[PDB]
Write a protein that binds this DNA or RNA. Structure first.
Lengths: 1066, 176, 326
DNA sequence: TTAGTTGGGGGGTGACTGTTAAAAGTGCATACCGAACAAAGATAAAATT
DNA sequence: AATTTTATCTCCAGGCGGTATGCACTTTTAACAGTCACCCCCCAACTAA
């Protein structure tokens, strides 16, 4: 059969020759096809000039010739092109660009930015032919070369090490084109290496070319902050109590913890006896986890293979975003997410959002690790720690941000967030893969008795009124298996655990807080970006006060109280105590007429389980940090209030969380510390609210026996402390007081306990300060007096007087309730007056208490609610009139501004700009897919109309919140210079037991200084200049100016008396 | 079969009438002419044809389209649903066999190495109603052909190792 | 937009229909919103003991004046049938009542399901609240709560054209088929007794009669057939599996099945229960590629019974109390 | 579990080479439809006739 | 201009899903005619993916 074999070989040879012929005429296109005939001829001629076709002269000729809101598809394409650079897949992006430029319909989406991105990507490799191709593209599309195009050309020429003639021609071309070389080096897109290479290319022919000289940053010169930054004076900045080596070791530990991105803690639940069933359950769990890992890896590989082909055919896909991270990291993240799921399920949209937020953080951290910022950060931090260490001396005492800048600040590698559609698409894809790839046996008790496999995650619908909501729910057998196994460990994300080293100083809206992980300066929804734009557009020295205050707040070193933790654990593990704040175990529970009992009993056990699991995380963290020192960074919301970043364990929780925290650095009690400790104890009890400090101290001294007994035997003694308003903090205060008293020298004992100083109705205090009304001011402790003044008691007394007068006149409902008017009835309404309450919202608040009232007849509730609401509001009118005028003025201004089609904005006295992010979402956004059509809201659509209903409701309270945040910031900044430890909760200030006098003095001084400036007139002038100054519209502007220019008049009150007020802060 | 009686064929377009009237005349005039340059010269003449001929051809085409539209509107009622199902299965099978044909042609157009031969196949090739003779040789079975059949595939083995090399370069990664 | 009956002949025919055959003569007739009272007096002249649950405070005086010397039965209670048994509020206002207190006042006693109809209720549905009333009655029926705890109570009411067409949809009319049709045909035997235009009834406003021809022309513009429907609970509704303490899973199953109308029942089964879906489909006697809108109301009940009847697997349903108020 | 050579005789479909036009597919956008659970009295702003 | 309709206390990071219809633009196949080029349906057999 030699002839047959010869014939087959011949046929194969002609076949491969035919294939070669049809190929030489699924590859990736490299030469664009151009609509213009003469440009196509020019490209053909440039190719045909020589086999070694020089492209440099043609590039010079192409450059020298030089003849509002993006769509969803455009944004996605731009993100694809940008990501193809970090991913290091350039042929893919180039082919997609050539294909889009080919077709008539697709070429209209492209914009100069995509061309620039691909040009820069090609230039980074020192290539010329592809750069010339993209130059042909940008010329044929009818666009113009820009700064970035010339930067790419210069970088390519410098990298390829060409002769100086072409560089001379290019540079002179930019000069004639009106282009500035110095302006080139300010482009954000260029990295350090690109700028260095461009500089080398420039220096080749202009050796005497230098960057602009560096200058020391300016200091803040504002009226309020000129005292903080004054260089003439005495400053004693506090130092930590630890040496340098310990701090460096802690920094290394925190860096390792953040690079790992996971921290595991030991569970605090009652350990279980290792029965046979527990071991069997653990074996089954381990086998299932391994199988899921392998299946997920296979599914991810198949998905990447599928997604690449779509780009290979000219469609946009998500291939680079999947290529960003390693396979093992993605699989581990998916497994952790599946493990953390609750038994009741999670919404589909929420899961899709969460699965895309964790992918970005790991990408950012790994990018930082690979690029080489970790070593620079290590060097800078180890040099900067000399300022806070006790056994180190900095040549000149500086603020932390000032020192961090003076040491030479390394440039921050800013990372671009993905657009919202890309994030949602990626999250949905990952969630679908996780749902599909996980399987478990149907019958766990006996393998192969029933061999069929069933899914682990199910996709059910949940109905609320008319609306459907897609919900993923775990299989019940898996939930029961997890509960039976009783795993002994918990897993926490590295951003949900307090830092083990002092946080990075805030030096810019981009850098600060955690060492590597990203953190928003202004916490808000994912897509919103107007706040960041306003922050960045401001002069650099405006935000120094806010950044310095945030850094000062984040540098407090905490530690965990021991004995309180032991007692709480003893109560928690055995039986619990709902009357104290410790949830009961699930074992202890109550356990068509039978339907009613079953419906109620199942209702009770839900929140009982919810509370127990919520407190399991907090108490497991504290045990893990029981012999360590930890820090809590801070950030702001869009008004200015500051919150800590770690949510699970911080001093903003309930009394159980506030009793486990104390300052790490202690101070001697001094000569006036024991009295403040006792007064704080009495304040915590809540028995003597309306009494002077002398009577509080006397009462504290008269019940010393109970305090001593509660400090000695807390759970087996008289148990006096349990009657307090806060049972748990009171125990800690009792222990501290007993320890201090028993000591040989009570004036030298070191105390680690914070002491609070609250403010009574701070919103109304700010309102009265703005309005300068004597009657209102005198009732919120803005005037000197001997006893505290309670506004709630005064309002209740006035209402009772009105009721007595009406009953004397004669009325059934009035005489129905006699003696039923008290502080408890009207406290909620008076408290909520600041938030714009009305005569309708107060009815439902008064009726809630009236229903719980027993002796009151239940047939008069409606009339009583009406009468009480009317009387309370009438009495409130007499006490506060300036407040009403201010509220009406602000509401009208906000409404008139919103009707013109613009969202309100203002500036706080410190300098932070504020803006209200209320808009109407009319058009709906969906994502069609394999499982469901997720509906999301496009935040960051600046074309939507303002929501007038939500902008006239939220303006008056946000102004007051910004004002109180400014007051707190000023107080913290001025307290730091005296060497005090300061931590604040919105309007409660904490400090050591020996510095309360100094803190009170600084509080009063800063309040007077802040409110002496003309706040209202400044706000009115800003509003007039920003909005009304328009020539295009005259009638709307006229109405707006008429409203704005009429500022309510001030009263007759003297602000200096606040400095002599004993109970302004009590 | 069933489709023909169910409905006739679509009317022929204007350029097709022009081909019908003129190309056979052009073909008759030139005896050695073949359909390639015949159809290309017909295209040239049609491009050179005056617009009056295009207009009259379009009028004929639209008249035929209208009469076909009326015929189809009448036909959709004259076919019992069983004929509709028969037509549906016929077109479905036609599409499937066409797809199979084009996939087989695609596979063979890349010079796929041959499958391993058989010892009986090599024997009958050397020895040589074809169905009768195939049955005869098959029942009879029941030059080193046994080893050569595997040897050829091992000879083809070096081809298939090489046959995967171009595909990854060309971009057809599904074949391997 | 309340309505009332004013014509003499229409009222006479309605009374003749309501009394019907003289079988079980002493049938108590609860009247929903008698209004002017011509229907009630027509029924009294027919010879039946009638008690009127009138809502408006201004109508009892006329009813009592006409019935002061009635010497028969014209007991009147200021109550509203659709406002019976509110679920929130500590005390019940005079317009509302309690399902137990009203029956205590009427003196009637509780009776098991298997026995006969103890009482009959007639009236007309709310103009803008047909769906709300239907859902409320379904929830009060399937749990044997409120008025249905006292036996099988017959309800005869008027309804509009659109709601009626939605209510009697069948797999032969899949455009309007929905859950409410299924859950109302599974428990009652719906009948059509009378037909009447909207012009026969004189509409009423808060102020009074709406005599305006332009708004009467709107009634001509909004002229829809006002069908009459009779509803009697089915005797064999509650089996050993469809207990009153178990209907919630059935309601959720029906709601989920109509979430994706154009999908087979096999995928809904795969997304609702862990059991082998094909086994359930085989047991109820259907093929794999069965659409949701091709299932008769009794087939849903059969499928639910088939799923609930098994015992091999401890967990049968994925519905839990957590899927509520989400 | 299914398909390729092998094997010639006999059919089958398309390629090659033209132009034309009526469906078929794509990507985006709006519109309408889907469970309940009382309500009494009040008031100013927003929407409609 | 008057009449009827609607919402009623702020911040700390929230969004319904499915089915039908319409429109502006791009892509695809069927129609004619002659050759001819390779593939594919048969009896029976064996080997690989």
């Amino acid at each position: 059969w030699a002839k047959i074999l010869e014939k087959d070989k011949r046929t194969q040879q002609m076949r491969m020759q035919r294939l070669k012929a049809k190929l030489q005429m699924r590859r990736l296109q490299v030469e664009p096809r151009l609509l213009s005939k003469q440009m196509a001829g020019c490209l053909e001629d440039c190719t045909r000039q020589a086999p070694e076709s020089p492209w440099e002269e043609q590039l010079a000729r192409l450059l020298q010739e030089a003849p509002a809101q993006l769509s969803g598809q455009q944004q996605r394409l731009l993100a694809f092109f940008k990501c193809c650079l970090l991913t290091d897949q350039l042929p893919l992006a180039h082919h997609l660009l050539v294909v889009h430029h080919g077709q008539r319909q697709k070429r209209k989406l492209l914009t100069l930015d995509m061309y620039n991105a691909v040009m820069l990507g090609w230039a980074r490799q020192g290539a010329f032919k592809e750069l010339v191709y993209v130059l042909f593209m940008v010329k044929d599309a009818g666009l113009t070369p820009d700064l970035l195009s010339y930067a790419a050309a210069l970088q390519c020429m410098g990298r390829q090490d060409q002769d100086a003639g072409t560089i001379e021609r290019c540079l002179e071309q930019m000069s004639q084109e009106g282009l500035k070389l110095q302006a080139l080096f300010t482009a954000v897109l260029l990295s350090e290496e690109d700028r260095a290479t461009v500089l080398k290319a420039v220096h080749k022919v202009k050796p005497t070319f230098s960057l602009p000289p560096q200058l020391p940053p300016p200091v803040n010169t504002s009226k309020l902050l000129r005292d903080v930054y004054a260089k003439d004076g005495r400053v004693s900045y506090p130092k930590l109590h630890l040496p340098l080596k310990t701090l460096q070791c802690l920094f290394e530990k925190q860096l390792h913890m953040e690079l790992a991105s996971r921290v595991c803690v030991v569970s605090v639940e009652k350990p279980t006896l290792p029965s046979k069933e527990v071991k069997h359950a653990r074996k089954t769990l381990k086998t299932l986890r391994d199988q899921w890992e392998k299946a997920l890896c296979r599914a991810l590989r198949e998905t990447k293979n599928r997604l690449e082909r779509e780009v290979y055919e000219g469609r946009f896909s998500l291939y680079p975003f999947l290529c960003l991270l390693d396979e093992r990291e993605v699989v581990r993240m998916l497994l952790q997410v599946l493990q953390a799921l609750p038994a009741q399920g999670e919404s589909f949209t929420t899961l899709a959002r969460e699965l895309s937020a964790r992918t970005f953080s790991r990408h950012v951290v790994q990018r930082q690790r690979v690029s080489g910022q970790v070593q620079a950060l290590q060097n800078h931090y180890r040099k900067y720690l000399c300022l806070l260490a006790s056994d180190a001396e900095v040549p000149e005492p500086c603020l932390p941000r000032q020192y961090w800048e003076e040491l030479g600040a390394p440039e921050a590698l800013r990372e671009q967030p993905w657009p919202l559609p890309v994030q949602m698409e990626l999250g949905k894809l990952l969630a679908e893969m996780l749902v599909q790839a996980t399987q478990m046996p149907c019958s766990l008790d006996k393998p192969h008795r029933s061999s069929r496999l069933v899914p682990v995650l199910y996709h059910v619908y949940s109905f609320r009124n008319v609306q459907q909501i897609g919900i993923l729910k775990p299989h019940p057998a898996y939930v029961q298996l997890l509960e039976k196994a009783a795993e002994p460990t918990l897993t926490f994300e590295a951003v949900d655990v307090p830092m083990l080293c002092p946080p990075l100083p805030w030096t810019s809206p981009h850098s600060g807080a955690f060492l590597l992980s990203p953190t928003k300066l202004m916490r808000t929804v994912e897509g919103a970006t107007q706040h960041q734009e306003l922050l960045e557009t401001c002069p650099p020295t405006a935000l120094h006060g806010a950044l310095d205050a945030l850094t000062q707040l984040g540098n407090c070193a905490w530690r965990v109280n021991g004995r309180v933790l032991d007692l709480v654990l003893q109560l928690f593990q055995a039986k619990g105590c709902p009357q104290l704040g410790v949830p009961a175990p699930p074992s202890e529970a109550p356990q068509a007429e039978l339907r009613r009992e079953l419906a109620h009993c199942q209702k009770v056990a839900r929140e009982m389980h919810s509370l127990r699991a919520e407190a399991l995380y907090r108490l497991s963290l504290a045990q893990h940090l029981r012999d360590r020192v930890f820090w809590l960074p801070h950030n702001m919301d869009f008004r200015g209030r500051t919150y800590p970043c770690p949510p699970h364990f911080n001093h903003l929780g309930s009394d159980v969380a506030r009793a486990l925290l104390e300052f790490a650095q202690g101070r001697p009690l001094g000569p006036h510390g024991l009295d403040w400790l006792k007064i704080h104890l009495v304040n915590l009890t809540g028995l003597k609210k309306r009494e002077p400090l002398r009577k509080r101290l006397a009462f504290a001294e008269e019940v010393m026996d109970d305090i001593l007994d509660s400090a000695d035997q807390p759970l087996t003694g008289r148990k006096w402390w349990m009657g307090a308003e806060e049972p748990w903090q009171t125990l800690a205060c009792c222990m501290e007081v007993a320890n201090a008293v028993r000591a040989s020298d009570p004036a030298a004992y070191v105390s680690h306990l914070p002491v609070h100083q609250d403010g009574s109705c701070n919103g109304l205090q700010h309102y009265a300060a703005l309005g300068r009304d004597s009657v209102g001011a005198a009732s919120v402790n803005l005037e000197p007096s001997d006893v505290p003044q309670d506004v709630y008691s005064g309002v209740a007394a006035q209402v009772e007087v009105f009721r007595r007068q009406d009953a004397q006149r004669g009325m059934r409902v009035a005489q129905v309730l006699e003696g039923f008017i008290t502080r408890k009835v009207v406290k909620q309404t008076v408290m909520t007056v600041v938030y714009g309450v009305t005569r309708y919202g107060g009815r439902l608040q008064i009726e809630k208490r009236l229903r719980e009232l027993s002796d009151f007849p239940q047939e008069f509730v409606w009339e009583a609610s009406h009468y009480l609401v009317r009387q309370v509001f009438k009495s409130l009118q007499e006490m506060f009139s300036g407040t009403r005028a201010i509220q009406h003025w602000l509401t009208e201004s906000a409404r008139l501004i919103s009707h013109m089609g613009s969202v309100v904005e203002w500036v706080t006295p410190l300098g932070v700009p504020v803006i209200q992010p209320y808009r109407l979402d009319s058009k709906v956004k969906q994502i069609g897919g394999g499982i469901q059509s997720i509906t999301y809201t496009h935040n960051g659509d600046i074309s939507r109309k303002p929501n007038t209903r939500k902008q006239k409701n939220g303006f008056p309270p946000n102004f007051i919140h910004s004002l109180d945040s400014s007051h707190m910031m000023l107080t913290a900044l001025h307290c730091y210079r005296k060497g005090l430890t300061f931590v604040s909760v919105h309007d409660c200030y904490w400090t050591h037991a020996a510095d309360v006098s100094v803190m009170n003095q600084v509080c009063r001084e800063q309040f007077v200084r802040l409110h002496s400036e003309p706040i209202l007139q400044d706000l009115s002038r800003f509003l007039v200049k920003r909005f009304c100054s328009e020539p295009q519209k005259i009638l709307e502007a006229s109405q707006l100016k008429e409203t704005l220019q009429a500022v309510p008049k001030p009263g007759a009150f003297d602000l200096e008396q606040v400095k002599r007020s004993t109970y302004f802060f009590s | 079969s069933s489709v023909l009686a169910s409905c006739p064929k679509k009317p022929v377009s204007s350029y097709l009438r022009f081909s019908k009237e003129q190309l056979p005349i052009f073909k008759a005039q030139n005896p050695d002419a073949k359909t390639t340059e015949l159809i290309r010269r017909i295209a040239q003449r049609w491009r050179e044809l005056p617009d009056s001929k295009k207009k009259i051809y379009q009028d004929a085409y639209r008249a035929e389209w209208q009469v076909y539209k009326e015929e189809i509107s009448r036909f959709k009622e004259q076919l019992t649903p069983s004929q509709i199902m028969s037509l549906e299965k016929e077109i479905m099978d036609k599409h499937l066999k066409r797809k199979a044909m084009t996939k087989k042609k695609e596979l063979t157009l890349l010079g796929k190495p041959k499958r391993p031969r058989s010892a009986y196949n090599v024997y009958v090739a050397e020895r040589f109603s074809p169905q009768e003779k195939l049955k005869t040789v098959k029942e009879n079975w029941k030059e080193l052909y046994i080893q050569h059949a595997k040897e050829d595939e091992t000879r083809y083995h070096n081809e298939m190792k090489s046959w995967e090399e171009q595909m990854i370069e060309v971009g057809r990664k599904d074949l391997l | 937009f309340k309505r009332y009956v004013t014509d003499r002949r229409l009222a006479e025919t309605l009374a003749q229909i309501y009394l019907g055959k003289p079988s079980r003569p002493p049938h108590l007739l609860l009247e929903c919103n008698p209004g002017p009272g011509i229907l009630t007096q027509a029924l009294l002249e027919a010879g039946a003991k009638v008690v009127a649950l009138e809502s408006d405070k201004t109508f009892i005086p006329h009813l009592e004046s006409l019935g002061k010397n009635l010497d028969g039965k014209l007991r009147v209670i200021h109550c509203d049938f659709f406002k019976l048994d509110p679920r929130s509020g500590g005390v019940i206002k005079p317009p509302a009542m309690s399902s137990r207190g009203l029956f205590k006042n009427l003196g009637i006693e509780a009776v098991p399901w298997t026995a006969d109809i103890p009482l009959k209720v007639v009236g007309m549905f709310p103009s803008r609240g047909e769906k709300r009333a239907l859902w409320k009655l379904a929830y009060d029926l399937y749990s044997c709560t409120s008025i249905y705890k006292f036996g099988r109570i017959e309800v005869n009411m008027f309804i509009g054209e659109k709601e009626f067409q939605k209510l009697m949809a069948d797999p032969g009319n899949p455009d309007l088929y929905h859950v409410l049709s299924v859950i109302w045909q599974l428990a009652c035997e719906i009948k059509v007794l009378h037909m009447e235009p909207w012009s026969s009834f004189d509409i009423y406003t808060r102020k009074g009669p709406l005599e305006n021809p332009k708004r009467r022309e709107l009634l001509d513009q909004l002229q829809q057939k006002l069908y009459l429907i009779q509803m009697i609970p089915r005797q064999n509704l509650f089996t050993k599996n469809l207990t009153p303490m178990n209907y919630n899973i059935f309601f959720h199953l029906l709601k989920h099945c109509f979430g994706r109308r154009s999908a087979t029942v096999i995928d809904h089964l795969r997304s609702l229960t862990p059991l082998d879906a094909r086994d359930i489909l085989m047991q109820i006697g259907k093929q794999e590629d069965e659409k949701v809108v091709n299932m008769h109301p009794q087939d849903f009940k059969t499928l639910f019974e088939t799923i609930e009847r098994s015992k091999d697997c401890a967990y049968k349903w994925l519905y839990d109390e957590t899927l509520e108020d989400r």
